Structure formats: structure tokens, C-alpha cells
């Protein structure tokens, strides 16, 4: 599960969480390619 930074609230959180995970993976990929 995801970890905190340290029309509804719950509805938008239901789509952003899977979409955030997605972007982390993509960030890690680009970083990993340039490290390669």
C-alpha cells in the first residue's frame, strides 16, 4: 500500500491511488534507464 508525504474526497482518492502507483513505477523506470 501507499505511504503518506511526511467531486468527493473518497471518490477522487479511489482513482488517484492506482494512478499514483502507476507514475512512481514510470519514474523509477526512467531513473533506472539513465542509471543503466
Amino acid at each position: 500500500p501507499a505511504v503518506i508525504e511526511e467531486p468527493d474526497e473518497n471518490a477522487i482518492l479511489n482513482d488517484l491511488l492506482p494512478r499514483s502507483v502507476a507514475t512512481q513505477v514510470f519514474a523509477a523506470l526512467l531513473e533506472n534507464a539513465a542509471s543503466e
Binding site: 467531486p7 471518490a11 477522487i12 488517484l16 494512478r19 507514475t23 514510470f26
Partner: protein, 75 residues
């Protein structure tokens, strides 16, 4: 912006985007807001009234004081 790049980065008078609950027309000074949008056309009234329409696969619209930022999905 999308996952790959900046799709819009300039002054605009307003944007029209189809939200999850209904249509949204964001003018300057609109109160801070976050809403997911549906796949469909986004209407952008740039600079001095020039209109431009672009079909988006959906995403999230974030509004604050001056700037509105559409975080668009590729699908």
C-alpha cells in the same frame, strides 16, 4: 500535463472540461478545487480569446487562485 510532457503551458482566459458530476467552466479567481474528469473534449480559451479544443482520455483537474492544471491520462 500528461505522464510524458507539458500539453499546455501558457496564459488562458478559461477552460471547459467535463467533470465526473457535470460540466466545469473555470474562470480566473475560481476557488480551489480538485475533480476527476471524463474522457472527452477540453475547451481552452487561450490568451486573447482564441479557442482550441482537444480530445482527452480523462484525468484530474486542479484549480487554484490563478492557475488551473489538467493532469491528463493517456488512456
Amino acid at each position: 500535463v500528461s505522464p510524458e510532457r507539458n500539453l499546455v503551458s501558457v496564459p488562458v482566459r478559461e477552460v471547459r472540461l467535463p467533470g465526473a458530476d457535470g460540466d466545469l467552466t473555470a474562470m480566473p479567481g475560481h476557488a480551489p478545487a480538485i475533480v476527476n474528469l471524463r474522457p472527452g473534449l477540453v475547451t481552452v480559451v487561450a490568451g486573447d480569446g482564441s479557442e482550441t479544443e482537444f480530445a482527452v482520455t480523462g484525468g484530474f483537474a486542479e484549480i487554484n487562485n490563478e492557475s488551473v492544471t489538467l493532469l491528463a491520462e493517456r488512456g
